[PDB]
Design a protein around this ligand. Structure first.
Ligand code: CU
Length: 99
């Protein structure tokens, strides 16, 4: 599943922001507009035994160019909340459910 980092109208959002995937299904986060951006999984809002470092960029890590991507596949079932560090307050957050 392809997820845009910034909307086509320049909005600071993940498109789509809420979605469900199956275990092993690739998520490709792609820089679109308003970059730099990153994708950080909230360590307190992912399956409790999951290592957020295995699936997340650090808050300092950034995707700098249009078209640059961050790819990750989630294994463990459950809800995973994530956000873009620099734009969290602006509302650039999402939630993916692995079922
Ligand atoms: Cu962002």
């Amino acid at each position: 599943i392809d997820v845009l980092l910034g909307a086509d109208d320049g909005s600071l959002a993940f498109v789509p922001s809420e979605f469900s995937i199956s275990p092993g299904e690739k998520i490709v986060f792609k820089n679109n507009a308003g970059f730099p951006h990153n994708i950080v999984f909230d360590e307190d809002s992912i399956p409790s035994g999951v290592d957020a470092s295995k699936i997340s960029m650090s808050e300092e890590d950034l995707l700098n160019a249009k078209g640059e991507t961050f790819e990750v596949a989630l294994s463990n079932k459950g809800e995973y909340s994530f956000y873009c560090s620099p734009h969290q307050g602006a509302g650039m957050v999402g939630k993916v459910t692995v079922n």
